[PDB]
UniProtKB/Swiss-Prot annotation:
Residues engaged in binding Ca(2+): 15, 34-35
Region (Disordered) residue spans: 115-135
Organism taxonomic ancestry: Bacteria, Bacillati, Bacillota, Bacilli, Bacillales
Biased amino acid composition, Basic and acidic residues: 115-131
Cell location: Secreted
Protein name: Nuclease A
Amino acid sequence: LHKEPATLIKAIDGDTVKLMYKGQPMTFRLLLVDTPETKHPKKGVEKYGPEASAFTKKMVENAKKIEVEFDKGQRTDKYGRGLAYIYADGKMVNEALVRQGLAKVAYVYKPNNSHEQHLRKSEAQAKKEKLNIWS
């Protein structure tokens, strides 16, 4: 896998950011994580949703460099969003959220599972520390 540069356009939610990628505006869904959402009217604003959403926002707005890393399988979902690991100054946003108890590891679809083990290990530590959704 390789990282590629991108530029932030806007953070939309805990699990979705809009980026300029290869000079095109694109919405990205963070791979392998499920955050409580502020969007979707099924429930609307879930618990820890505003917290997950602020975390991702801060982390991408305060970065010097954002990079996107596609996995080995499909690179977009059925809504047209890119599927990727997103890095802010070298730190994966997907992992940061899970490590803080602000996301769970999602149901995985092979072969888009390259960082699955690494994320599950961070999720087990956040549960053990009883952070946020695990409190």
